[PDB]
Design an enzyme around this catalytic site. Structure first.
Site, mmCIF file in Angstrom:
data_model
loop_
_atom_site.group_PDB
_atom_site.id
_atom_site.type_symbol
_atom_site.label_atom_id
_atom_site.label_comp_id
_atom_site.label_asym_id
_atom_site.label_seq_id
_atom_site.Cartn_x
_atom_site.Cartn_y
_atom_site.Cartn_z
ATOM 1 N N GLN A 163 0.821 -1.206 0.000
ATOM 2 C CA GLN A 163 0.000 0.000 0.000
ATOM 3 C C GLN A 163 0.856 1.257 0.000
ATOM 4 O O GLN A 163 0.750 2.087 -0.901
ATOM 5 C CB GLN A 163 -0.933 0.015 1.210
ATOM 6 C CG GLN A 163 -1.669 1.328 1.400
ATOM 7 C CD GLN A 163 -2.630 1.288 2.570
ATOM 8 O OE1 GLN A 163 -3.132 0.226 2.939
ATOM 9 N NE2 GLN A 163 -2.888 2.447 3.163
ATOM 10 N N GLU A 215 -3.636 -7.067 -2.133
ATOM 11 C CA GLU A 215 -5.036 -6.671 -2.235
ATOM 12 C C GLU A 215 -5.197 -5.833 -3.500
ATOM 13 O O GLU A 215 -4.258 -5.155 -3.922
ATOM 14 C CB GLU A 215 -5.479 -5.879 -0.999
ATOM 15 C CG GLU A 215 -5.295 -4.372 -1.118
ATOM 16 C CD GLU A 215 -5.233 -3.674 0.228
ATOM 17 O OE1 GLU A 215 -6.036 -4.020 1.119
ATOM 18 O OE2 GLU A 215 -4.376 -2.778 0.394
ATOM 19 N N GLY A 258 2.355 -6.517 5.718
ATOM 20 C CA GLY A 258 2.753 -7.880 5.424
ATOM 21 C C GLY A 258 3.265 -8.062 4.009
ATOM 22 O O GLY A 258 4.112 -8.917 3.752
ATOM 23 N N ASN A 301 8.303 7.354 9.224
ATOM 24 C CA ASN A 301 6.999 8.007 9.172
ATOM 25 C C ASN A 301 6.770 9.013 10.297
ATOM 26 O O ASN A 301 5.901 9.874 10.192
ATOM 27 C CB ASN A 301 5.872 6.971 9.154
ATOM 28 C CG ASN A 301 5.417 6.629 7.747
ATOM 29 O OD1 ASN A 301 5.700 7.361 6.796
ATOM 30 N ND2 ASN A 301 4.698 5.521 7.608
ATOM 31 N N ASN A 337 3.061 11.582 1.804
ATOM 32 C CA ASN A 337 3.554 11.147 0.503
ATOM 33 C C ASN A 337 3.952 12.307 -0.404
ATOM 34 O O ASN A 337 4.867 12.177 -1.218
ATOM 35 C CB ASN A 337 2.529 10.255 -0.196
ATOM 36 C CG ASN A 337 2.281 8.961 0.549
ATOM 37 O OD1 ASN A 337 3.113 8.519 1.340
ATOM 38 N ND2 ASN A 337 1.128 8.347 0.303
ATOM 39 N N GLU A 361 27.093 4.998 -8.473
ATOM 40 C CA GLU A 361 27.767 6.105 -7.795
ATOM 41 C C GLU A 361 27.281 6.280 -6.360
ATOM 42 O O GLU A 361 27.979 6.858 -5.529
ATOM 43 C CB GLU A 361 27.601 7.415 -8.571
ATOM 44 C CG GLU A 361 28.622 7.621 -9.675
ATOM 45 C CD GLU A 361 28.778 9.079 -10.060
ATOM 46 O OE1 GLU A 361 29.170 9.354 -11.214
ATOM 47 O OE2 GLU A 361 28.514 9.953 -9.206
HETATM 48 N N1 GTP Z 1 4.632 7.341 3.954
HETATM 49 C C1 GTP Z 1 3.531 6.602 3.861
HETATM 50 N N2 GTP Z 1 3.400 5.470 4.637
HETATM 51 C C2 GTP Z 1 2.282 4.712 4.550
HETATM 52 C C3 GTP Z 1 1.260 5.058 3.680
HETATM 53 N N3 GTP Z 1 0.281 4.134 3.802
HETATM 54 C C4 GTP Z 1 0.663 3.215 4.718
HETATM 55 N N4 GTP Z 1 1.900 3.563 5.193
HETATM 56 C C5 GTP Z 1 2.703 2.844 6.196
HETATM 57 O O1 GTP Z 1 2.654 1.452 5.959
HETATM 58 C C6 GTP Z 1 2.624 0.737 7.175
HETATM 59 C C7 GTP Z 1 1.668 -0.445 7.055
HETATM 60 O O2 GTP Z 1 1.918 -1.221 5.900
HETATM 61 P P1 GTP Z 1 0.982 -1.109 4.591
HETATM 62 O O3 GTP Z 1 1.037 0.291 4.034
HETATM 63 O O4 GTP Z 1 -0.447 -1.504 4.888
HETATM 64 O O5 GTP Z 1 1.651 -2.104 3.516
HETATM 65 P P2 GTP Z 1 0.859 -3.376 2.921
HETATM 66 O O6 GTP Z 1 1.729 -4.049 1.897
HETATM 67 O O7 GTP Z 1 -0.450 -2.916 2.321
HETATM 68 O O8 GTP Z 1 0.584 -4.393 4.141
HETATM 69 P P3 GTP Z 1 -0.650 -5.434 4.101
HETATM 70 O O9 GTP Z 1 -1.827 -4.843 3.362
HETATM 71 O O10 GTP Z 1 -1.062 -5.735 5.520
HETATM 72 O O11 GTP Z 1 -0.212 -6.732 3.464
HETATM 73 C C8 GTP Z 1 2.171 1.713 8.250
HETATM 74 O O12 GTP Z 1 3.109 1.743 9.301
HETATM 75 C C9 GTP Z 1 2.140 3.072 7.588
HETATM 76 O O13 GTP Z 1 2.953 3.971 8.304
HETATM 77 C C10 GTP Z 1 1.384 6.198 2.896
HETATM 78 O O14 GTP Z 1 0.487 6.522 2.121
HETATM 79 N N5 GTP Z 1 2.525 6.968 2.991
HETATM 80 MG MG MG Z 2 -2.484 -3.253 2.186
#
Ligand code: GTP
Ligand code: MG
Ligand code: GTP
Ligand code: MG
Lengths: 421, 231, 435
Positions: free
Chosen positions: C11, C72, C145, C207, C229, C255
């Protein structure tokens, strides 16, 4: 689109499930046959199946081992939007004995309901699991429900098994038997079990809502209001605990420790609220639905859900503060015990409300009192004939007793400080 | 009321229960259910665990009486063994689990080797129910630790068995993996590279821990045991 | 031309990539169509850098060399139905039906394993459309995950078939303020162990730092993921500006490892950026240089004036004149700000990219005539691991939540190995500061 299949079991199960469906209809903006803010329409296919008509019929199944109460919902208001072939019922009840529902008459009905859910699953993009409304007190809800759970997992081994168990109270004389047996099954097969104590439920209606002699109906309004708020993360986008699996991971540190308490706020039905007030009223024991002392004990993990006209920032600042003051009630070896979720959708007619899902170690007092009642009868070998004549064994009783006893031992065990191995 | 043949399949479960227990005592105190397996192949899956538990108990008693013809035996194994592994080892009852296995083991004694039996248990590795997969692995495990590779061409046998092993060794379910590893140490007691490095490490540790009958093998032992009475 | 493929997992990875590809499109004059903005005739990059990240798949049609991965379909579907639905080819947006559910295990061992073949094919399709593939740019969180489990798995299979190609990583270090999972410390420690030898240089994005930067400098009382973001992309775009435009430093993926990493295991530079003004005056080279050494301007929340500095690359953008930078940089050396390591012969390296930095019109950031980005490999970043290791250690002492991992194809002993490796990594960062 991660669909969910609901299964109501027994009188309590079908009556509670009914109130649940009657509630989340309006929140999603549907008629009582299935027909604004657009958020109400997004995750609409999670609990409701889209019939080729633009009209939605709940992905629900209504099973009872006797037409009695399933007949009742059948011709009630929401009896319409229910799929006519999702109703399953046998000729004669199970007379409040766990053995019949689990071995004899209940097992003979199980295969017939399986066809329905197997047909239902054949209409889901990617089903995520099941939720079951039942009662551990009776014979159909506890016995057949648990047998249904075990066989549902045998067919769908990688799906989530949520459960809304209703706990019996001292007010028939075999409820501890049925409850202890179902718990013995739930601890091995249930992924998530929201425990709702009928005694606490009753006391809320009588003390808080000052309803003199409350009915099952009033008791169900509180179960429904909680279930709605609980599944808020499941029926609305851009949240925290979107899956039944995500929610379980965040809440279940240990496999056989997946039994939760629920709390709801506000409650007081006079006859607006502020975020700090709402938060205090959420952690209030007066606002809990389980007759155990939540302050005496430790929260392993928490998952709150705020809804309505409430700002995220003011909710997050209030939860963070509350956690600071009461840092002794939250276990130290689980950093960030609490997951706080906010939704814009209002429960209506309420400006805002908060639902409380806790994995507390204080819940041992629920299993403690029941285990103490199970024992007092089992020592006298009382009422056994009604169970053992259905093919049961005295050993299975001793297993349920000793098992659920270990369950307690684990809750008290984890009320210990930072210790290695 | 009577007769036994109808009560065995009568609508009420309790009748089927008591009738199975009657078949059981009939076997012990010795009615030829050995000819047609379809009879007990129906009882092994009684659809009422309390009664099914006793059909298997009686099944074990049935095979414990015989004591000839290797062709008819292969059919008994091909009919019963897959049923006992699927609906008896996956069961969560102590009596059912123990008795079911004992049947599968004792039915394997009728044969000359574990080959036919094992090859009947193998195709369960492709099922999606983990406790069924682990049951099959634990079953093949027991088959070896009871009879061994005796009278088997290890050239044809093993590479077929190991063919579906890695996929299982990386299976999500913990128990399946735990049983898979238990199958490895047995194969040794008488493949890697496709296995996780940490699995191989733990294997190598488990290796450093060793000290140190079919039907016909019983008939031969007694053939000489009897003739040893030439006093 | 030496191409670079940008792979986004999870995500956070895909949503950050959305912002990055929105800014890269705006910097090179590419409309959401993949076509040139009105009047251009030529992309603002090419001929110099734009060809590296964009692929002219046909006359007038420019498509980013990118691959989105998510277990997903939710996040990616937004792209497929968004205003940039025409930017990417549909073959570049890969999704499953169920996610890893905050579990590194099913992301790495169970679920994510099932979508692996697809991703390895699409990458190969892209790698074949290259005339001199330079490497990859991984962007993913370490909390979830998928981005953690499948991301690390993907970084391992890339080292397997694209060995001679270098890989750079943008990792979203987890923060309690915006966390989505209690088991984030687990996921983090697990991937860092499994990507510690499959990344040539990893830029860490805490973050918590981005959050508080949006809160302080941008004046937002509760920054959303979109807010975070926007800022992140503004920084990442600055980090890779020399690749896409006229560069005098870090004009090559290789580099980076050369300029920033002394040893393989140490490849986590501390990134600073300046200025970050609200979209509601004008500054200077001296100010933005000084600001790079102040605590509230780093991608990871630690002190710029702490620890040991082993390598440093100052990268300026926009209307910047060499006299000012030599002067401003000298003002930093003479005043003895940071503490350089004794064994490093050379010191501060300077790069200039005259292409002015830009912020998207729909963002909360203002456009500056000149900005700087400092990439410094300091030993103060060890504190970030130190922090996450406590969180990890606390839970693991009771084996909390472990069953979720062993139930998804992982050995309990893998937690041990992933902990020792990070423990060794901690020691590596303190022992490399001696001499
Ligand atoms: N910088 C930033 N961090 C994000 C954003 N969205 C989620 N996160 C970070 O991502 C972490 C959680 O993981 P996910 O973003 O859900 O990654 P994922 O691959 O979707 O994980 P799963 O859906 O559970 O399999 C959190 O600690 C958030 O801080 C975003 O839009 N920007
Ligand atoms: Mg996700
Ligand atoms: N909260 C709530 N509890 C109920 C309700 N109806 C029954 N119960 C509880 O359920 C227990 C008995 O089980 P029931 O649900 O009534 O009946 P059943 O589960 O179908 O079992 P059988 O009557 O044997 O078929 C009692 O202890 C009640 O406290 C209800 O409408 N609301
Ligand atoms: Mg009833």
């Amino acid at each position: 689109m991660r669909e969910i299949i609901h299964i109501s079991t027994g009188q309590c199960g079908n009556q509670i499930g009914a109130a649940f469906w009657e509630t989340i209809c309006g929140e999603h903006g549907l008629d009582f046959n299935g027909t604004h803010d657009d958020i109400q329409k997004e995750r609409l296919n999670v609990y409701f199946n889209e019939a080729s008509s633009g009209k939605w019929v709940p992905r629900s199944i209504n099973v009872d081992l006797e037409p009695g109460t399933i007949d009742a919902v059948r011709n009630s208001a929401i009896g319409n939007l229910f799929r006519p072939d999702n109703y399953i019922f046998g000729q004669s009840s199970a007379g409040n004995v766990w053995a019949k529902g689990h071995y004899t008459e209940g097992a003979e009905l199980v295969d017939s309901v399986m066809d329905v859910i197997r047909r239902e699953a054949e209409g889901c993009d990617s089903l995520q699991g099941f939720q079951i409304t039942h009662s551990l007190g009776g014979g159909t809800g506890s016995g057949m429900g648990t047998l249904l759970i075990s066989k549902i997992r045998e067919e769908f081994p990688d799906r989530m098994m949520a459960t809304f168990s209703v706990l019996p109270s001292p007010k028939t004389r075999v409820e501890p038997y049925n409850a202890t047996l179902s718990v013995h099954q739930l601890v091995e097969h249930s992924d998530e079990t929201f425990c709702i104590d009928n005694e606490a439920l009753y006391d809320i209606c009588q003390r808080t809502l000052k309803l003199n002699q409350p009915s099952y109906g009033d008791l169900n309004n509180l179960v429904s209001s909680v279930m709605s708020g609980v599944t808020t993360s499941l029926r609305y986008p851009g949240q925290l605990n979107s899956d039944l699996r995500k929610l379980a991971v965040n809440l279940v540190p240990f496999p056989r420790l997946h039994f939760f308490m629920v709390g709801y706020a506000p409650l007081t039905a006079i006859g607006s609220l502020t975020v700090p007030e709402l938060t205090q009223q959420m952690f209030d024991a007066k606002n809990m639905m389980a007759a155990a002392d939540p302050r005496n004990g430790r929260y392993l993990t928490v998952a709150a859900f705020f809804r309505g006209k409430v700002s995220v920032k003011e909710v997050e600042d209030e939860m963070h503060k509350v956690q600071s003051k009461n840092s002794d009630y939250f276990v130290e070896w689980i950093p960030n015990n609490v997951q706080t979720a906010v939704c814009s959708v209002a429960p209506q007619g309420l400006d805002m409300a908060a639902t409380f899902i806790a994995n507390s170690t204080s819940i041992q007092e629920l299993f403690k009192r029941v285990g103490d009642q199970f024992s007092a009868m089992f020592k006298r070998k009382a009422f056994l004939h009604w169970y053992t004549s259905e093919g049961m064994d005295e050993l299975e009783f001793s297993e349920a007793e000793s098992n659920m006893n270990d369950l307690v031992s684990e809750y008290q065990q984890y009320q210990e400080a930072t210790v290695e191995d | 009321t009577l007769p036994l043949e109808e009560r065995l399949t009568y609508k009420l479960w309790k009748a089927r229960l008591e009738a199975y227990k009657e078949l059981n005592q009939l076997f012990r105190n010795s009615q030829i259910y050995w000819r047609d397996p379809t009879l007990f192949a129906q009882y092994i899956t009684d659809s009422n665990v309390v009664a099914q538990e006793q059909a298997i108990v009686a099944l074990n008693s049935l095979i414990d009486a015989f004591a000839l013809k290797n062709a008819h035996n292969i059919t008994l194994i091909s009919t019963w063994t897959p049923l006992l592994v699927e609906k008896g080892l996956t069961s969560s009852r102590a009596t059912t689990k123990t008795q079911s296995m004992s049947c599968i083991l004792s039915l394997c004694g009728l044969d000359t080797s574990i080959t036919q039996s094992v090859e009947l248990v193998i195709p369960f590795f492709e099922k999606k129910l983990p406790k069924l997969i682990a049951a099959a692995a634990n079953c093949v495990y027991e088959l070896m630790a009871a009879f061994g590779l005796t009278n088997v061409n290890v050239q044809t046998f093993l590479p077929e068995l190991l063919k579906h092993v890695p996929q299982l060794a990386g299976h999500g379910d913990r128990n399946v993996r735990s049983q898979t590893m238990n199958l490895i140490v047995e194969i040794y007691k008488v493949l890697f590279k496709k296995l996780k490095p940490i699995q191989v490490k733990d294997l190598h540790k488990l290796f450093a821990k060793v000290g140190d009958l079919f039907e016909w093998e019983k008939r031969e032992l007694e053939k000489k045991r009897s003739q040893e009475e030439e006093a | 031309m030496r191409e670079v493929i940008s792979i986004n997992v999870g995500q956070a990875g895909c949503q950050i990539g959305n912002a990055c590809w929105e800014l890269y499109s705006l910097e090179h004059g590419i409309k959401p169509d993949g076509h040139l903005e009105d009047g251009l005739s030529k992309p603002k990059g090419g001929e110099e850098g734009f060809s590296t990240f964009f692929h002219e798949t046909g006359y007038g049609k420019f498509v980013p060399r990118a691959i989105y991965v998510d277990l997903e379909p939710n996040v990616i579907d937004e792209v497929r139905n968004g205003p940039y639905k025409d930017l990417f080819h549909p073959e570049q947006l890969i999704s499953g039906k169920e996610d890893a559910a905050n579990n590194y295990a099913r992301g790495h061992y169970t679920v994510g394993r099932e979508i692996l073949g697809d991703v390895l094919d699409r990458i190969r399709k892209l790698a074949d459309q290259c005339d001199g593939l330079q490497g990859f740019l991984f962007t993913h969180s370490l909390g979830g995950g998928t981005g953690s489990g499948l991301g690390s798995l993907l970084l391992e299979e890339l080292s397997a078939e694209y060995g001679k190609k270098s890989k750079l990583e943008f990792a979203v270090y987890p923060a309690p303020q915006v966390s989505t999972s209690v088991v984030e410390p687990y996921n983090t420690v697990l991937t860092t162990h499994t990507t510690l030898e499959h990344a040539d240089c990893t830029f860490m994005v805490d973050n918590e730092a981005i959050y508080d930067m949006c809160k302080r400098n941008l004046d937002i009382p509760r920054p959303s993921f979109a807010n975070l973001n926007n800022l992140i992309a503004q920084v990442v775009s600055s980090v890779t500006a020399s690749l896409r435009f006229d560069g005098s430093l870090n004009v090559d993926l290789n580099e980076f490892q050369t300029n920033l990493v002394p040893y393989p295991r140490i490849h986590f530079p501390l990134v600073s950026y300046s200025p970050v003004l609200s979209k509601s005056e004008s500054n200077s080279v001296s100010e933005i240089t000084n600001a790079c050494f102040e605590p509230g301007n780093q991608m990871v929340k630690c002190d710029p004036r702490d620890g040991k500095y082993m390598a440093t690359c100052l990268l300026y953008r926009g209307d910047v004149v060499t006299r000012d930078v030599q002067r401003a940089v000298e003002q930093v050396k003479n005043k003895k700000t940071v503490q350089l390591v004794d064994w490093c012969p050379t010191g501060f390296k300077i790069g200039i990219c005259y292409e002015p930095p830009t912020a998207t019109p729909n963002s909360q950031l203002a456009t500056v005539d000149r900005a700087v980005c400092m990439l410094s490999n300091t030993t103060s970043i060890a504190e970030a691991w130190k922090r996450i290791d406590r969180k990890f250690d606390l839970m693991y002492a009771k084996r909390a939540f472990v069953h979720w991992y062993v139930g998804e194809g992982m050995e309990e002993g893998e937690f041990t190995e992933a902990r020792e490796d990070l423990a060794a990594l901690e020691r590596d960062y303190i022992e490399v500061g001696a001499d």
